[PDB]
Amino acid sequence: MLTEFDAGYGEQPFRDLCANYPGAEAYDPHDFRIEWGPIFHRGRLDGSARVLIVGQDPAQHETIVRRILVGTAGRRTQGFLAKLGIVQSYVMVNTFLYSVYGQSGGSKHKNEPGIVDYRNKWFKAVLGPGNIEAVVSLGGLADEAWKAWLKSSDGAAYKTLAYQHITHPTWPESSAHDSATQAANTKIMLAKWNAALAALAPEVKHPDVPTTLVPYGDAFKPSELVDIIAKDLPAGLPAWMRGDTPWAVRQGVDAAAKRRTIMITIPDGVIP
Amino acid sequence: MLTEFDAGYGEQPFRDLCANYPGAEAYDPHDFRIEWGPIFHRGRLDGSARVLIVGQDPAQHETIVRRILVGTAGRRTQGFLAKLGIVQSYVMVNTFLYSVYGQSGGSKHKNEPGIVDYRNKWFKAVLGPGNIEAVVSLGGLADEAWKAWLKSSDGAAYKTLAYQHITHPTWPESSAHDSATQAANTKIMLAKWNAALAALAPEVKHPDVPTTLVPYGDAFKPSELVDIIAKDLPAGLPAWMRGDTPWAVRQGVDAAAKRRTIMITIPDGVIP
Numbered sequence: 395m396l397t398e399f400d401a402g403y404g405e406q407p408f409r410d411l412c413a414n415y416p417g418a419e420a421y422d423p424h425d426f427r428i429e430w431g432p433i434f435h436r437g438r439l440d441g442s443a444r445v446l447i448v449g450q451d452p453a454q455h456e457t458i459v460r461r462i463l464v465g466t467a468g469r470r471t472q473g474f475l476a477k478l479g480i481v482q483s484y485v486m487v488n489t490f491l492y493s494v495y496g497q498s499g500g501s502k503h504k505n506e507p508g509i510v511d512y513r514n515k516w517f518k519a520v521l522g523p524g525n526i527e528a529v530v531s532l533g534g535l536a537d538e539a540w541k542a543w544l545k546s547s548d549g550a551a552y553k554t555l556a557y558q559h560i561t562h563p564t565w566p567e568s569s570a571h572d573s574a575t576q577a578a579n580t581k582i583m584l585a586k587w588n589a590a591l592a593a594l595a596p597e598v599k600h601p602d603v604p605t606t607l608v609p610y611g612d613a614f615k616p617s618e619l620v621d622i623i624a625k626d627l628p629a630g631l632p633a634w635m636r637g638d639t640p641w642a643v644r645q646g647v648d649a650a651a652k653r654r655t656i657m658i659t660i661p662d663g664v665i666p
Numbered sequence: 667m668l669t670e671f672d673a674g675y676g677e678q679p680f681r682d683l684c685a686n687y688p689g690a691e692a693y694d695p696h697d698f699r700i701e702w703g704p705i706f707h708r709g710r711l712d713g714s715a716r717v718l719i720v721g722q723d724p725a726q727h728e729t730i731v732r733r734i735l736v737g738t739a740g741r742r743t744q745g746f747l748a749k750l751g752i753v754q755s756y757v758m759v760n761t762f763l764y765s766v767y768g769q770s771g772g773s774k775h776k777n778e779p780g781i782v783d784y785r786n787k788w789f790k791a792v793l794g795p796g797n798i799e800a801v802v803s804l805g806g807l808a809d810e811a812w813k814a815w816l817k818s819s820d821g822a823a824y825k826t827l828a829y830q831h832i833t834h835p836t837w838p839e840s841s842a843h844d845s846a847t848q849a850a851n852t853k854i855m856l857a858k859w860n861a862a863l864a865a866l867a868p869e870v871k872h873p874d875v876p877t878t879l880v881p882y883g884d885a886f887k888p889s890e891l892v893d894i895i896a897k898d899l900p901a902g903l904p905a906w907m908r909g910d911t912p913w914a915v916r917q918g919v920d921a922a923a924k925r926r927t928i929m930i931t932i933p934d935g936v937i938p
Contacts, residue, residue, distance in 0.1 A: 396685055397686075399684060399685060402900070414668055417667075628900065629732075630687065650937075654932040655929065660701055
């Protein structure tokens with residue numbers, strides 16, 4: 395009758411990190427959705443993580459769950475991990491604590507010290523135990539964040555750590571509206587994702603499940619879209635929040651109203 | 667620049683309690699909003715609590731924050747506690763883990779063993795350390811819950827524990843639609859609240875702030891509506907979620923649609 399949960403941030407160094415987080419002094423309040431509060435991570439903070447995922451920024455689903463990569467990109471990222479035999483032993487951190495507001499380029503502030511220094515504190519904490527055997531970045535700003543970590547004194551010890559940059563999971567859908575272009579761009583993505591898997595598989599020596607690598611084809615198969623596990627979510631969150639159906643969107647009559655609002659709709663079938 | 671937060675349920679016995687909580691077998695899925703998952707408590711689980719509040723059930727604000735009594739009733743309860751010199755040293759649990767669905771009362775499934783036995787486990791855990799000096803129940807079902815706890819084997823030790831039943835904080839607005847009657851019933855409520863405070867003040871010997879009792883008038887004063895403290899909210903939740911302006915409602919064209927949806931709207935003034 396047991397349901398697992400992520401108890402979160404009671405242990406040091408994470409407790410102090412969560413109590414002293416950067417606000418408007420580091421993250422521009424127009425260019426970042428700092429209004430929703432920071433979302434810190436997803437996964438293992440007990441030292442059992444074997445793979446580190448560096449993502450870009452949280453969206454509206456993360457804003458309700460209070461953990462990162464729990465939307466469509468997370469489920470695609472989960473399936474990527476499953477092919478390495480990694481089912482629960484991961485930890486995930488984002489480039490930015492808050493959502494980027496606008497396709498106006500999120501690089502504007504990519505080198506702000508308040509942002510970079512705090513993030514590096516999180517890198518140090520999760521890498522500290524020395525149990526991470528591989529690191530994967532999602533998209534370009536993620537790649538630059540990891541490289542900026544490596545140029546720091548504490549990061550220089552990790553230039554040797556197995557690392558792969560892959561294309562951000564929702565790139566096909568952000569690149570185009572048309573279905574035909576989306577599928578072609580998906581095919582391109584999965585080819586690149588397969589190359590990362592080939593480089594990473596020999597390097598993931600401690601899988602949760604010993605698994606022989608099955609490369610992606612041209613499109614995502616449903617088995618390659620894996621729900622976020624119960625162990626990653628705060629106590630008491632319902633199972634549909636870690637299901638396969640979208641359930642949160644931003645909505646408003648104009649830009650200002652849309653920015654102020656999140657809509658949650660429980661998937662059909664949960665309520666009898 | 668430090669912001670306190672509630673790390674939650676990492677310690678035993680609360681860890682096992684939250685991993686093994688009652689679902690549909692105890693809480694009827696039509697008569698309870700089990701679809702949102704359980705909301706367990708608000709306040710101190712480290713044993714430093716001096717006052718226990720027993721409430722009735724969570725609503726849509728509690729459903730987002732994942733702690734109880736964070737709406738209007740919560741801000742009125744905080745002010746009641748403040749008049750005893752209690753600012754953070756409280757613990758709060760509800761009669762039911764889930765919202766009662768329907769005006770057809772909470773009274774219908776109140777004797778469900780699955781419901782009562784699990785709640786009694788929470789009473790046992792928070793009272794365990796032995797530092798609670800006073801108990802306040804909000805409304806009748808809470809009152810029945812506390813008394814039924816006392817008749818249990820583990821509850822019998824607490825019959826001498828100072829106890830007051832008080833009118834549930836949102837009774838005035840629930841009793842009538844009109845301004846004059848709501849005001850008349852508010853005046854009636856606060857006189858009874860004054861009576862409980864007088865009985866409780868001598869028994870709260872370790873207040874957070876040593877305080878001489880100042881009674882309610884006829885209406886709530888703005889000083890008596892106290893924002894929930896940051897230390898009660900999960901890491902990273904923005905300050906407006908613990909402010910004085912409502913920010914969540916259920917929305918739908920009919921009952922079934924309204925049951926499936928919660929709308930969150932950030933208060934005006936937070937975003938520049």
